[PDB]
Structure 1
Amino acid sequence: MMLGEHLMSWSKTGIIAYSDSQSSNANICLTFLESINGINWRFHTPQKYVLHPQLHEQFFYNISSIHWNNWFSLPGDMLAVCDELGNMTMLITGQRPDRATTYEKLTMVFQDNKIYNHVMPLKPVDKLKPMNIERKQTRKEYNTSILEFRWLTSSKSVIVSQFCAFDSSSNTYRSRAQQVPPYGVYHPPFIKYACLAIRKNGQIDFWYQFSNSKDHKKITLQLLDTSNQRFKDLQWLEFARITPMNDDQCMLITTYSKLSKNISFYKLHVNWNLNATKPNVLNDPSLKIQFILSTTLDPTDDEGHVLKLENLHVVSKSSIEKDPSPEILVLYNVCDTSKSLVKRYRLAPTQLSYNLRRHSDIVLDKKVTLITSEMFDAFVSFYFEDGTIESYNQNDWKLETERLISQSQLGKFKNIIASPLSAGFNYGKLPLPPSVEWMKVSPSMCGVIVKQYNKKWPQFYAAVQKNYADPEKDSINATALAFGYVKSLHKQISAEDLTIAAKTHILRISFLDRKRAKEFITTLLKSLYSFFNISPDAPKEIMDKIITSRPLQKIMLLQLELGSCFSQENIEEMARVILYLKNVLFAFNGVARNFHFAIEQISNNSNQQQNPKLFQTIFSKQDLIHSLIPVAKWFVKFITYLTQEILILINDPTNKEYTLVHGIFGAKMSRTLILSILNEIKKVTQIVAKFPETSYPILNESSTFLKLVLSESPVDFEKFETFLVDVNNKFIALCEQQPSQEREFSLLVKAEIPPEYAKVGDFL
């Protein structure tokens, strides 16, 4: 039997929403990955919910498919689930009718049965009282049973990377990122969202919401637009795969109706703006359909063995590839033979001097039980019977795990790597599909999710490498995992799966030689900077851009997890203090800009004193500065720790356990960042002194306390200000004395000084 290709969906924000078929009080579950003790990981507690058609005011039905709106560049928070009865239930997470909430709390938008608006925040089953709802099983495949659900993206563009190559001239890996223009059908900004669903009887649906209204609208048609309803209700489509094509507002509805035993093709057209001359009049989009082609399947192979169509998966192909025609991969299995044939067809127009052109045939040695297409990766995954997975690339259908062995090394570009799977990281012995409810390869292909019948919790399997004793392969592996994150950030993926896989390999290295594992981290994170065209050895102008960059919230988090096992080590400590300084940065400069605008509001709003709006405005002015006082206590408490270590290190310079103090001062932007914090602190105090609170003396305590805490600090800030300023100048002249770029990495990440610069350490 075919597995649950759409039973589970990894949302782009990490929420794992999957269908539940065992609990008698719930049908859907929500969970996510969390860290146990900084080293290990565990899934979060399952948040069970119950979905029935009568939430608007009682038996609930099973869940057919779950589709997170993670397609293209969508935010990925609006989850729409379609049940077995055909009702499409849309749940929005991260928002409440009155306020904003976290990502683990759900909320409804509208229910379909006719469609109506009813906003109501859902509650978990366990917390809710025992209700009179029983699991009624809709064991009937209705006319409205949705076969395939597809989301509609907006007009925004997505920028990703295609592949990287090893530049033998510079002995470094180089990657190029190509912007991907939108292809297929995209909804305009004035429409809040749109989605399409194909029902098993051929009836189509088009849900959409206007951005300026709350009422929802639905437009429905049927594929077989014949004059007789006798054939209208006959199109029982076995497979209905919707692949958008480069044609404008067109989707190729590749259907296989067993009534006529032919793989029929269709074209769907939508006009977003019917009246372009009247932009104010927002008209409903018009839907059109046009039959194109139909072909019959081949009965036999070349040698005389008959074939059976097991699956019909067509790849969502963009215009980037050489031939943009979608690949209709009609799978065939030779009976009583381990071989499995995958014939490939392409749809092309008929040219004068449409049609399906056969390119080639590919033979696989094991039977296939599941096919899943990766998103933004162009990878077809063949989940064979024995548990092994062979992901074939869309470009050449060359095995990714064995591409390095068979790659033609000679050439301009060598060692073409697209994912960590190219290095050789193969999954272990996965559980057999008969025992497995559903599988899904993780987005980065680093591991596989398996749900088990007797396991109440989801499992997880990571990739392993057999030749971990060979030291010469560390250069390639670090670069391969470096590019794995490069694609993830461009697609706004959490990439928590990739983090787990990297740590396991490092842990096995550290068991034999602890010295070797430390260098693996340094080389791995260095390639990230080269891939993203960011240089820690650049002039100071780019350095300001680095501090505000989102990646440091994640790339520094990498060593926060990859260095957790190393007790009494400063690799994670150096990243955390810089990361927390960023939080410290968001505290003062986050409100320094806010406080500056409050100065102008005082003068222009001084003509109405008795109004009931100024009194709340006045109260909020002096309340905000009060909340900064607890932050300032940790700000002073932080600078004392580094000054305390100065006295300790002088007596015993040979103590390696206190080498963190070197990296903190060595960081180039941190010295400027603290100076900027000290600059705005002076500006804030000068402004407060220049513009004190006079209407209410009682409110001056917060302003006065700000002056007192600075003066009463055990160490004067002015003396400490000159401390970091002098370090910057001395560390710049040393660069001119001898050119070196590793020292920039050493002062920022390694938190150490190379032995070749042992004289520099004595100066501190």
Structure 2
Amino acid sequence: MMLGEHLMSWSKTGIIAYSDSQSSNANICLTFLESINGINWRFHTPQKYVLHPQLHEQFFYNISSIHWNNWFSLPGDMLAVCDELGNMTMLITGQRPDRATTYEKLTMVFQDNKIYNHVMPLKPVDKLKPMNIERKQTRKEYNTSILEFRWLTSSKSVIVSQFCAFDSSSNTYRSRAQQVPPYGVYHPPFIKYACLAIRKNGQIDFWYQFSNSKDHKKITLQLLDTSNQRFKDLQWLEFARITPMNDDQCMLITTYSKLSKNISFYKLHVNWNLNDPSLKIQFILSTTLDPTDDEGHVLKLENLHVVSKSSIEKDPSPEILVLYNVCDTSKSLVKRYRLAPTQLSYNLRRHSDIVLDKKVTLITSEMFDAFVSFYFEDGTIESYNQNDWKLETERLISQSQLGKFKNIIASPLSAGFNYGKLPLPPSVEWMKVSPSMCGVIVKQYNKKWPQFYAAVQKNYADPEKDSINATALAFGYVKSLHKQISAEDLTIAAKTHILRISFLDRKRAKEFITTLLKSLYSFFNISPDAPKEIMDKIITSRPLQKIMLLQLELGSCFSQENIEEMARVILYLKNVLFAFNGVARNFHFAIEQISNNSNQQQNPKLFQTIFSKQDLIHSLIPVAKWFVKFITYLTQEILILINDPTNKEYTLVHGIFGAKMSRTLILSILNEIKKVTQIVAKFPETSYPILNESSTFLKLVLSESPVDFEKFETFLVDVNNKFIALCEQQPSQEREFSLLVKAEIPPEYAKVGDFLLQYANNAVISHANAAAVYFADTSGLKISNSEFFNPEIFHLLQPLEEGLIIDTDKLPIKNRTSKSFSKLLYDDVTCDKLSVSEISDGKLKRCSRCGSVTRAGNIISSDKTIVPTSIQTKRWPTMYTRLCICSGMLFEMDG
């Protein structure tokens, strides 16, 4: 039997929504990947929901297919699920009727049965009271049973990369990115969205919503536009695959009706241009299938998968891959046809025939990858590229090395990372290769939780292959960022290989990270050795929220190591950057609002405006405490390092000062701090003296700091000048990487390391209290991973043979909840202590990536305000409602 090609859908934001067929109270499930202890990973708790046609005001039906709107450049949040009865239920996540919410909470838009608008936020089944809903099975394939669902993209363009080649002239890998113009059918901006569904009887549907209205509209037709309804209700289409073509507003509805035993072709046309779009249909061609092969063995059509081919490829005609299996023979033939117009001096031209040695039980086309996956019976997967149908896992062996471009690599699968012995399809409910092809998702009958299998490499003892492997995994992320994919699957696969390397030689594994991340900069045309102008662009760049997160996970096992610590402090400094400069721009505009709105004092709008002006500065005080607490830690390490320069465990101090933008970034923070204080002094609060406490406290905390900022300001300024003249003395680009990522100084520059120890003592410490800073309480900075997760789980739990992902059932009884995973003591965004009330209310969020815990995006209690009051004010924590500091997703913490 054919597997569940569309039972599960990995949303582009990481949400895994899959069909549920075992629970008697729910039919759909939601989950996602989260980190257990920074090393291992586990799936989140399943959030079960029940879907029935009568949610608008009772038996529910099974789910037929799940289609996340991750196609092209769509945001990927609006999930539309079609049940077995044919009703299309549309669920929007990440939004509420009154406010914005996280990505694990659902909401309805409209229900189809006639279509009507009814906004209602759904609730989980477990939390909901026991209802009188029973699992009625719609075992009948109705006329309205949707065969294939397809989404419609907008007019936006998508920029991706095609492949990379090894430039032997420079001994480095080079990649080229080509913009992909939209092809097929795209909906205009004034339409909120559009979608198309083909029903098993031939009736077509076209749901759309106007961006300026709430009412939904539906337009329906039928494929066989004959004068008789006798044949209208006869088109029982076995396969109905919709492949958009380069023709404008055209979709090739390749159908195979067993009534006429021919693979009929159709063309669908839509005129967008507020009038309703007009739908047109035009029959084109019909052909018969071949009965026999060349040698005399008969064939049976197992599947009809047509590839969604763009105009980039040489021949844009879609590949109609009609699969045939020679009976009683392990061989399986895949005949390829292409549709072309008939030329004078349409038709199907046969190119060639491809023989496979194992029977195929499932075909899935990858998105934005052009990869057809052949899920054979024995569990092995052979992904053939669309360009040449050459096996990706064996392309390197058979590649013609000689030429201008050598070692053409498109994915980490080209290196040789092959999946292990997957479970047999009979026991498997459904499979799906991960988006980056690094692993496969398997759902099992007797397993209540999804499994996971990663790629392995047999020749891990050969050291000469580390150069290729690091480059191959480097390009894997390059495509993911361009497609806005989380790429959490690729992160797990990279760590397992590194772990096996570190078991034999720990020194070798460290160099693997450095070479791997270096290729990312070359691929994206970003250079850490560039002039200072580009350096400003780097700090604001999104990738550092993810590329730095790579070493945050790839370096977790290395205890007492500064690879992850160096990335976290820079990453948290970015959060520190968003704090002051995020509000410095906001506070600047408040100055002008005072003068122009001074002509109406008694209005009820100015009083709330005045109150909000002095309330905002109050919330910065908890952040400033961690800001001062951070600079003291680095100054404390200066005194310790002088006595014992040979201590390798304290080498993190070198990298922090070595970073070039960090010295400028702190100077900019000190600059705006001076500007804010000067502006506050220039423009103080005079109407209400009681509100001056927050403004006055800002001046006091700077003056009362144990170390003067002006003395510390000159400290980093002098380092920049000395580190620039050294570049002119000898040209080197690895030192830029060393001062930013390695947090070390190369042995060839051992003389440079001695300068940091000697000069730092006389520069700033001479104006501060030496005895006080050494004994100062700077603990609790939440810098190391050891003080993020609880000590019970901060260790390896399973052997590397069993894999890196851990099922929840194997966790300790007291450690089987997300509440016991981390230290729930301090906040991570506003850097404020968490009281018992904020802990117990269940309104705080946890990051599935770095383990951070934050109550951002929620109304703060009255005790945290300037004056206890019931007035609700939307504070700056609302920026991180859905995205964490490390670009991870934030979810409501379970109680």
TM-score interval, smaller chain = over 0.9
Distance in 2, matches of 1:449 and 1:676, equals 47
Question: Any idea what the Cα deviations from partners look like across 1:359-418, whole Å, max 9, x if unmatched?
Answer: 000000000000000000000000000000000000000000000000000000000000
Report the Cα distance in structure 2 between the residues aligned to 1:548 and 1:150, rounded to whole angstroms. 36
Aligned twin of 1:41 = 41
Counterpart of 1:25 in structure 2 is 25
1:265, CA displacement in angstroms? 0.0
Name the CA distance, whole Å, in 1 between partners of 2:456 and 2:16. 24
Counterparts of 2:310 and 2:571, CA distance in 1: 39
SS in 1 for 2:478: helix
Deviation at residue 351 of structure 1 after TM alignment? 0.0
Q: Deviations over 1:685-723 (max 9, x none)?
A: 000000000000000000000000000000000000000
How many Å apart are 1:74 and its aligned residue? 0.0
Which residue does 1:280 correspond to in 2? none
- Residue deviations 1:557-587 (CA, integer Å, cap 9, x gap): 0000000000000000000000000000000
The SS at the match of 1:759 is helix
Deviation, structure 1 residue 535 = 0.0
CA distance in 2, matches of 1:102, 1:188: 28
SS at 1:304's partner residue? coil
The 2-side partners of 1:426 and 1:624 are apart by 54
Is the partner of 1:673 in helix, strand or coil? helix
Match of 2:132 in 1: 132
* Post-superposition CA distance 1:88-142 (Å, at most 9, x none): 0000000000000000000000000000000000000000000000000000000
Question: Structure 2 CA distance, aligned partners of 1:254 and 1:490?
Answer: 31
Determine the C-alpha separation between the residues in 1 that align with 2:288 and 2:591. 76
| Mapped partners of 2:226, 2:291: distance in 1 | 30
**TM superposition shift of 1:443:** 0.0
Partner secondary structure for residue 82 of structure 1: strand
2:731 and 2:291 map into 1 onto residues whose CA distance is 70
Structure 1: how far apart are the matches of 2:357 and 2:130?
A: 52
Q: How much has 1:227 moved relative to structure 2?
A: 0.0
Could you tell me how far 1:263 is from its partner in structure 2? 0.0
Which one of the candidate residues 456, 466, 470 is aligned to 1:478?
A: 470
1:247 CA drift (Å): 0.0
In the other structure, the counterpart of 2:355 is: 363
Matched, 1:723 2:712: no
Structure 1 distance, partners of 2:308, 2:124, is 36
SS in 1 for 2:17: strand
What pairs up with 1:401-480 in 2 under 5 angstroms?
A: 401-480=393-472
Q: How far is 1:676 from its partner?
A: 0.0
The CA deviation at 1:494 is 0.0
CA apart distance, 1:287: 0.0
Give 2:559's aligned residue.
567
Question: What is the correspondence of 1:603-614 to structure 2 with a 5 Å cutoff?
Answer: 603-614=595-606
The Cα shift of 1:71 comes to 0.0
Q: CA deviation at 1:435?
A: 0.0
CA deviation after TM superposition for structure 1 residue 146, in Å: 0.0
- Is the partner of 1:439 in helix, strand or coil? strand
Indicate the residue corresponding to 1:351 in structure 2: 343
Superimposed CA distance per residue, residues 130-184 of structure 1 (whole angstroms, 9 cap, x where no aligned partner): 0000000000000000000000000000000000000000000000000000000
> What is the distance in 2 between the residues matched to 1:124 and 1:186?
35
CA distance in 2 between counterparts of 1:600 and 1:619 reads 16
Superposed displacement of residue 228, structure 1? 0.0
Residue 596 of structure 1 corresponds to 588
1:618 positional shift: 0.0
Q: How does 1:335-346 map to 2 (within 5 A)?
A: 335-346=327-338
Cα distance in 1, alignment partners of residues 247 and 211 from structure 2 = 26
Determine the C-alpha separation between the residues in 2 that align with 1:424 and 1:603.
67
Q: Which has the higher contact order (CA 8 A, sep 6+)?
A: 2
1:284 aligns with 2:276: yes
What SS does structure 2 have at the residue aligned with 1:594?
Answer: helix
Residues 506-558 of structure 1, C-alpha deviations (whole Å, 9 max, x = no match):
00000000000000000000000000000000000000000000000000000
State the alpha-carbon separation in 1 of the partners of residues 162 and 389 from structure 2.
16
Distance 2:44 2:136 in 1: 28
The aligned residue for residue 736 of structure 1 is 728
Distance (Å, rounded) in 1 between the aligned partners of 2:249 and 2:638: 67
Secondary structure of the corresponding residue to residue 643 of structure 1? helix
Q: Spell out, residue by residue over 1:333-373, the C-alpha distance to the aligned partner (whole angstroms, 9 max, x if none).
A: 00000000000000000000000000000000000000000
Distance apart, 1:189 and its partner CA: 0.0
Q: Distance in 2 between matches of 1:466 and 1:754?
A: 33
Partner of 1:513: 505
Q: Matches of 2:398 and 2:748 in 1, distance apart?
A: 41
Counterpart selection for 2:390 from 386, 393, 398: 398
Tell me the distance in 2 between the aligned counterparts of 1:372 and 1:557.
30
> Normalised by the size of structure 2, how large is the TM-score?
0.84
What is the distance in 2 between the residues matched to 1:174 and 1:381?
27
2:509 alignment partner, SS class: helix
- Kindly state the Cα deviation for residue 238 of structure 1 after the two structures are TM-superposed: 0.0
* 1:461 to partner: Cα distance: 0.0
SS of the aligned residue for 1:429 comes to coil
Secondary structure at 1:383 match in 2: strand
1:204 and 1:427 mapped to 2: Cα distance? 40
Q: Deviations over 1:420-460 (max 9, x none)?
A: 00000000000000000000000000000000000000000
Deviation, structure 1 residue 496:
0.0
- Secondary structure in 2 aligned to 1:132? coil
State the SS of the aligned residue for 1:404.
helix
Question: Which whole-Å CA distance do the structure 1 matches of 2:103 and 2:361 have between them?
Answer: 34
1:83 CA drift (Å): 0.0
In the alignment, the residues of structure 1 paired with residue 389 and residue 581 of structure 2 have an alpha-carbon distance, to the nearest angstrom, of 52
Output the CA distance in 1 between the equivalents of 2:350 and 2:720.
66
The alpha carbon displacement at 1:292 in A equals 0.0
Secondary structure at the aligned position of 1:468 is classed as coil
User: TM-score, structure 1 length as denominator?
Assistant: 0.99
Name the SS of the counterpart of 2:534 in structure 1.
Answer: helix
- Secondary structure, counterpart of 1:409 in structure 2: coil
Partner of 2:207, secondary structure, is strand
Distance 2:675 2:200 in 1: 68
Distance 1:39 1:116 in 2: 48
1:320 is matched with which residue? Answer: 312
Give unpaired runs (5+ residues) of structure 2.
Answer: 754-893
User: What SS does structure 1 have at the residue aligned with 2:255?
Assistant: strand
Cα distance, 1:225 vs structure 2: 0.0
Task: Summarize deviations over 1:219-247 as a string: whole Å, max 9, x none.
Answer: 00000000000000000000000000000
Q: Secondary structure at the match of 1:219?
A: strand
Is structure 2 residue 227 aligned with structure 1 residue 235? no
Shift of 1:487: 0.0
Determine which of 671, 674, 677 is the counterpart of 1:682.
Answer: 674
What is the percentage of aligned positions where both structures have the same residue?
100
Q: Using the alignment, how far apart are the partners of 2:170 and 2:438 within structure 1?
A: 29
What secondary structure is seen at the aligned counterpart in 2 of 1:189? coil
Question: 2:226 is paired with a residue of what secondary structure?
Answer: coil
